[PDB]
Design a protein around this ligand. Structure first.
Ligand SMILES: CCc1cc(C)n(-c2ccc(N)cc2)n1
Length: 287
Protein backbone atom coordinates (compact mmCIF):
# COMPACT_ATOMS: atom_id res chain seq x y z
CA UNK A 1 0.00 0.00 0.00
CA UNK A 2 1.90 2.97 -1.39
CA UNK A 3 1.14 6.11 0.59
CA UNK A 4 0.27 7.33 -2.87
CA UNK A 5 -2.66 4.91 -3.14
CA UNK A 6 -4.01 5.58 0.33
CA UNK A 7 -3.87 9.33 -0.48
CA UNK A 8 -5.96 8.77 -3.59
CA UNK A 9 -8.57 6.78 -1.63
CA UNK A 10 -8.83 9.40 1.15
CA UNK A 11 -9.13 12.21 -1.44
CA UNK A 12 -11.73 10.27 -3.46
CA UNK A 13 -13.78 9.59 -0.32
CA UNK A 14 -13.52 13.16 1.07
CA UNK A 15 -12.53 11.54 4.41
CA UNK A 16 -9.61 13.79 5.56
CA UNK A 17 -11.77 15.26 8.35
CA UNK A 18 -12.87 11.78 9.55
CA UNK A 19 -9.23 10.48 9.63
CA UNK A 20 -8.12 13.66 11.45
CA UNK A 21 -10.88 13.35 14.06
CA UNK A 22 -9.86 9.62 14.56
CA UNK A 23 -6.33 10.83 15.32
CA UNK A 24 -7.67 13.38 17.79
CA UNK A 25 -9.66 10.66 19.70
CA UNK A 26 -6.66 8.26 19.93
CA UNK A 27 -4.13 10.96 20.89
CA UNK A 28 -2.35 10.84 24.32
CA UNK A 29 -3.45 13.03 27.20
CA UNK A 30 -0.75 13.70 29.84
CA UNK A 31 -0.83 16.30 32.53
CA UNK A 32 0.44 19.83 32.14
CA UNK A 33 0.40 21.02 35.83
CA UNK A 34 3.50 23.23 35.58
CA UNK A 35 2.15 25.05 32.56
CA UNK A 36 -1.06 25.77 34.43
CA UNK A 37 0.57 27.36 37.54
CA UNK A 38 -0.76 30.95 38.01
CA UNK A 39 2.74 32.40 37.73
CA UNK A 40 3.16 30.98 34.20
CA UNK A 41 0.00 32.48 32.86
CA UNK A 42 1.87 35.21 31.00
CA UNK A 43 4.37 32.67 29.54
CA UNK A 44 1.66 30.90 27.37
CA UNK A 45 0.29 32.38 24.22
CA UNK A 46 -2.83 30.22 24.43
CA UNK A 47 -4.58 28.73 27.39
CA UNK A 48 -5.35 25.48 25.51
CA UNK A 49 -1.75 24.86 24.22
CA UNK A 50 0.48 23.51 26.88
CA UNK A 51 3.60 21.32 27.02
CA UNK A 52 3.22 18.05 28.92
CA UNK A 53 5.20 17.95 32.14
CA UNK A 54 7.15 14.81 31.12
CA UNK A 55 8.54 16.24 27.87
CA UNK A 56 8.70 20.05 28.70
CA UNK A 57 12.02 21.91 28.28
CA UNK A 58 13.29 23.24 31.60
CA UNK A 59 15.17 26.52 31.62
CA UNK A 60 18.43 26.02 33.69
CA UNK A 61 17.73 29.16 35.72
CA UNK A 62 16.56 29.31 39.31
CA UNK A 63 13.48 31.60 39.72
CA UNK A 64 11.14 30.05 37.10
CA UNK A 65 12.21 27.23 34.80
CA UNK A 66 9.06 27.37 32.59
CA UNK A 67 8.87 27.82 28.81
CA UNK A 68 6.11 26.66 26.46
CA UNK A 69 8.39 24.15 24.65
CA UNK A 70 8.48 20.29 24.28
CA UNK A 71 11.27 17.84 23.42
CA UNK A 72 9.99 15.41 20.73
CA UNK A 73 12.37 12.41 20.87
CA UNK A 74 11.83 10.07 17.86
CA UNK A 75 13.73 6.97 18.93
CA UNK A 76 13.73 4.81 15.80
CA UNK A 77 14.29 7.79 13.46
CA UNK A 78 17.19 8.82 15.85
CA UNK A 79 16.28 12.55 15.69
CA UNK A 80 14.99 15.00 18.29
CA UNK A 81 13.18 18.35 17.89
CA UNK A 82 12.10 21.08 20.28
CA UNK A 83 8.69 22.46 19.37
CA UNK A 84 7.80 25.79 20.95
CA UNK A 85 5.23 28.58 20.57
CA UNK A 86 6.26 31.86 18.91
CA UNK A 87 8.04 33.93 21.54
CA UNK A 88 5.94 36.45 23.46
CA UNK A 89 7.27 39.99 24.19
CA UNK A 90 8.20 38.84 27.71
CA UNK A 91 9.57 35.37 26.72
CA UNK A 92 12.20 36.32 24.11
CA UNK A 93 15.04 36.08 26.58
CA UNK A 94 13.72 32.70 27.71
CA UNK A 95 13.58 31.50 24.05
CA UNK A 96 17.28 32.33 23.61
CA UNK A 97 18.22 30.90 26.92
CA UNK A 98 16.62 27.66 25.78
CA UNK A 99 18.59 27.80 22.51
CA UNK A 100 21.76 28.38 24.46
CA UNK A 101 21.20 25.68 27.08
CA UNK A 102 20.05 23.01 24.69
CA UNK A 103 22.99 23.67 22.29
CA UNK A 104 20.79 24.04 19.33
CA UNK A 105 22.32 25.09 16.08
CA UNK A 106 19.26 25.98 14.17
CA UNK A 107 15.91 27.56 14.68
CA UNK A 108 13.12 26.96 12.24
CA UNK A 109 10.32 29.49 11.99
CA UNK A 110 7.18 28.81 9.97
CA UNK A 111 5.03 31.94 10.45
CA UNK A 112 5.35 35.69 9.94
CA UNK A 113 5.39 38.03 12.99
CA UNK A 114 2.18 39.60 11.64
CA UNK A 115 -0.62 37.55 9.90
CA UNK A 116 -4.30 38.49 9.38
CA UNK A 117 -3.46 41.79 11.14
CA UNK A 118 -2.57 40.04 14.44
CA UNK A 119 0.76 39.59 16.15
CA UNK A 120 1.54 35.87 15.89
CA UNK A 121 5.05 36.20 17.24
CA UNK A 122 7.36 38.79 18.80
CA UNK A 123 10.23 40.15 16.73
CA UNK A 124 12.65 38.08 18.69
CA UNK A 125 15.62 38.48 16.33
CA UNK A 126 17.31 41.72 15.03
CA UNK A 127 16.19 42.92 11.61
CA UNK A 128 19.39 45.02 11.14
CA UNK A 129 23.02 44.14 11.59
CA UNK A 130 23.75 47.40 13.41
CA UNK A 131 20.92 47.11 16.01
CA UNK A 132 21.75 44.11 18.17
CA UNK A 133 19.29 42.88 20.86
CA UNK A 134 20.18 42.54 24.47
CA UNK A 135 18.05 40.23 26.61
CA UNK A 136 18.72 41.76 30.08
CA UNK A 137 16.84 39.09 32.07
CA UNK A 138 18.77 36.10 30.63
CA UNK A 139 22.07 37.99 29.98
CA UNK A 140 22.24 37.31 26.28
CA UNK A 141 23.24 39.31 23.30
CA UNK A 142 21.93 38.61 19.83
CA UNK A 143 23.35 40.02 16.52
CA UNK A 144 22.23 39.70 12.88
CA UNK A 145 25.42 38.62 11.03
CA UNK A 146 23.92 38.06 7.57
CA UNK A 147 20.78 37.20 5.75
CA UNK A 148 19.94 35.44 2.45
CA UNK A 149 16.43 36.29 1.31
CA UNK A 150 14.98 33.91 -1.28
CA UNK A 151 11.44 33.84 -2.70
CA UNK A 152 9.89 31.22 -0.31
CA UNK A 153 12.23 31.42 2.69
CA UNK A 154 15.10 33.37 4.37
CA UNK A 155 18.24 31.93 6.13
CA UNK A 156 19.97 34.21 8.67
CA UNK A 157 23.18 33.77 10.40
CA UNK A 158 22.89 35.03 13.96
CA UNK A 159 25.53 35.33 16.68
CA UNK A 160 24.33 34.59 20.18
CA UNK A 161 26.65 35.66 23.00
CA UNK A 162 26.49 34.70 26.69
CA UNK A 163 27.37 38.01 28.36
CA UNK A 164 28.29 36.10 31.58
CA UNK A 165 31.12 34.13 29.90
CA UNK A 166 31.57 36.01 26.59
CA UNK A 167 31.21 32.63 24.73
CA UNK A 168 29.56 33.20 21.33
CA UNK A 169 27.83 30.78 19.03
CA UNK A 170 26.56 30.92 15.51
CA UNK A 171 22.85 30.12 15.17
CA UNK A 172 21.17 29.51 11.85
CA UNK A 173 17.65 30.92 11.56
CA UNK A 174 15.57 29.18 8.80
CA UNK A 175 12.41 31.19 8.18
CA UNK A 176 9.73 29.89 5.86
CA UNK A 177 8.12 33.19 4.87
CA UNK A 178 5.29 32.19 2.54
CA UNK A 179 2.84 29.88 4.40
CA UNK A 180 -0.57 31.29 3.29
CA UNK A 181 -2.61 33.33 5.72
CA UNK A 182 -5.42 30.76 5.27
CA UNK A 183 -5.17 27.02 4.63
CA UNK A 184 -1.96 25.30 3.53
CA UNK A 185 0.45 25.69 0.58
CA UNK A 186 -1.17 24.28 -2.52
CA UNK A 187 2.08 22.49 -3.32
CA UNK A 188 4.61 21.19 -0.84
CA UNK A 189 7.52 21.90 -3.29
CA UNK A 190 8.81 25.02 -1.50
CA UNK A 191 8.25 23.53 1.99
CA UNK A 192 10.34 20.44 0.93
CA UNK A 193 13.17 22.55 -0.56
CA UNK A 194 13.15 24.48 2.77
CA UNK A 195 13.35 21.22 4.70
CA UNK A 196 16.29 19.91 2.61
CA UNK A 197 18.09 23.26 3.19
CA UNK A 198 17.73 22.89 6.97
CA UNK A 199 19.06 19.24 6.64
CA UNK A 200 21.94 20.38 4.35
CA UNK A 201 23.07 23.03 6.93
CA UNK A 202 23.92 20.28 9.49
CA UNK A 203 21.52 21.74 12.12
CA UNK A 204 19.65 18.39 12.38
CA UNK A 205 22.80 16.46 12.91
CA UNK A 206 23.53 14.50 16.13
CA UNK A 207 26.56 16.68 16.91
CA UNK A 208 24.09 19.44 17.78
CA UNK A 209 21.31 19.96 20.22
CA UNK A 210 17.81 19.50 18.93
CA UNK A 211 16.64 21.96 16.35
CA UNK A 212 14.14 24.51 17.58
CA UNK A 213 10.91 24.73 15.63
CA UNK A 214 8.00 27.06 16.06
CA UNK A 215 5.04 28.70 14.43
CA UNK A 216 2.62 30.78 16.50
CA UNK A 217 1.27 28.03 18.91
CA UNK A 218 4.06 25.51 18.13
CA UNK A 219 1.71 22.65 17.15
CA UNK A 220 0.21 23.09 13.60
CA UNK A 221 2.71 24.13 10.98
CA UNK A 222 5.50 23.06 13.37
CA UNK A 223 3.96 19.64 13.48
CA UNK A 224 4.02 19.34 9.68
CA UNK A 225 7.77 20.05 9.54
CA UNK A 226 8.77 17.49 12.16
CA UNK A 227 6.19 14.85 10.94
CA UNK A 228 7.41 15.20 7.35
CA UNK A 229 11.12 15.04 8.35
CA UNK A 230 10.65 12.05 10.66
CA UNK A 231 8.57 10.13 8.10
CA UNK A 232 11.28 10.75 5.49
CA UNK A 233 14.03 9.55 7.90
CA UNK A 234 11.98 6.44 8.72
CA UNK A 235 11.51 5.53 5.00
CA UNK A 236 15.25 5.75 4.32
CA UNK A 237 16.08 3.82 7.49
CA UNK A 238 13.76 0.91 6.94
CA UNK A 239 14.35 -1.50 4.17
CA UNK A 240 10.77 -0.77 3.15
CA UNK A 241 9.44 2.81 2.55
CA UNK A 242 5.81 1.60 2.03
CA UNK A 243 5.83 0.33 5.69
CA UNK A 244 5.86 3.92 7.16
CA UNK A 245 2.42 4.89 8.43
CA UNK A 246 2.23 8.68 8.84
CA UNK A 247 -0.86 8.27 11.14
CA UNK A 248 1.10 6.14 13.61
CA UNK A 249 4.16 8.46 13.38
CA UNK A 250 1.91 11.43 14.17
CA UNK A 251 0.43 9.60 17.20
CA UNK A 252 3.91 8.82 18.38
CA UNK A 253 4.88 12.58 18.25
CA UNK A 254 1.64 13.48 20.01
CA UNK A 255 3.00 11.57 23.03
CA UNK A 256 5.47 14.46 23.42
CA UNK A 257 3.33 17.50 22.61
CA UNK A 258 -0.42 17.94 22.30
CA UNK A 259 -2.27 18.89 19.20
CA UNK A 260 0.39 18.38 16.54
CA UNK A 261 -1.30 18.96 13.17
CA UNK A 262 -4.31 21.11 13.87
CA UNK A 263 -6.58 20.75 10.83
CA UNK A 264 -7.59 18.08 8.38
CA UNK A 265 -5.92 20.34 5.66
CA UNK A 266 -2.64 20.24 7.54
CA UNK A 267 -2.90 16.44 7.73
CA UNK A 268 -3.51 16.24 3.96
CA UNK A 269 -0.57 18.62 3.31
CA UNK A 270 1.73 16.49 5.47
CA UNK A 271 0.74 13.35 3.46
CA UNK A 272 1.53 15.30 0.29
CA UNK A 273 4.84 16.48 1.58
CA UNK A 274 6.00 12.99 2.61
CA UNK A 275 4.80 11.47 -0.71
CA UNK A 276 6.61 14.18 -2.80
CA UNK A 277 9.60 14.13 -0.56
CA UNK A 278 10.08 10.32 -0.85
CA UNK A 279 9.72 10.57 -4.71
CA UNK A 280 12.36 13.33 -4.90
CA UNK A 281 14.90 11.19 -2.95
CA UNK A 282 -2.11 28.12 -15.75
CA UNK A 283 -2.72 31.67 -17.13
CA UNK A 284 -5.15 33.43 -14.72
CA UNK A 285 -5.90 36.79 -13.03
CA UNK A 286 -8.31 35.77 -10.26
CA UNK A 287 -7.18 38.70 -8.05
C1 LIG B 1 16.66 9.18 20.85
C2 LIG B 1 16.37 10.43 20.05
C3 LIG B 1 17.63 10.97 19.48
C4 LIG B 1 18.81 10.25 19.14
C5 LIG B 1 19.68 11.21 18.65
C6 LIG B 1 21.05 11.03 18.15
N1 LIG B 1 19.00 12.41 18.72
C7 LIG B 1 19.31 13.68 18.13
C8 LIG B 1 19.23 14.86 18.85
C9 LIG B 1 19.49 16.10 18.28
C10 LIG B 1 19.84 16.22 16.94
N2 LIG B 1 20.10 17.48 16.31
C11 LIG B 1 19.92 15.03 16.24
C12 LIG B 1 19.66 13.79 16.81
N3 LIG B 1 17.76 12.27 19.22
Amino acid sequence: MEMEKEFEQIDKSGSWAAIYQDIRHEASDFPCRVAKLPKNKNRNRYRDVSPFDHSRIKLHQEDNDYINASLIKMEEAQRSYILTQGPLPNTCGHFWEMVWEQKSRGVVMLNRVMEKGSLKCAQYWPQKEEKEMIFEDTNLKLTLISEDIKSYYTVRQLELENLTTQETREILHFHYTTWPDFGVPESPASFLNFLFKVRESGSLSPEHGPVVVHCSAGIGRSGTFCLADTCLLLMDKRKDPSSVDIKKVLLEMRKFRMGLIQTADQLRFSYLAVIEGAKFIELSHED
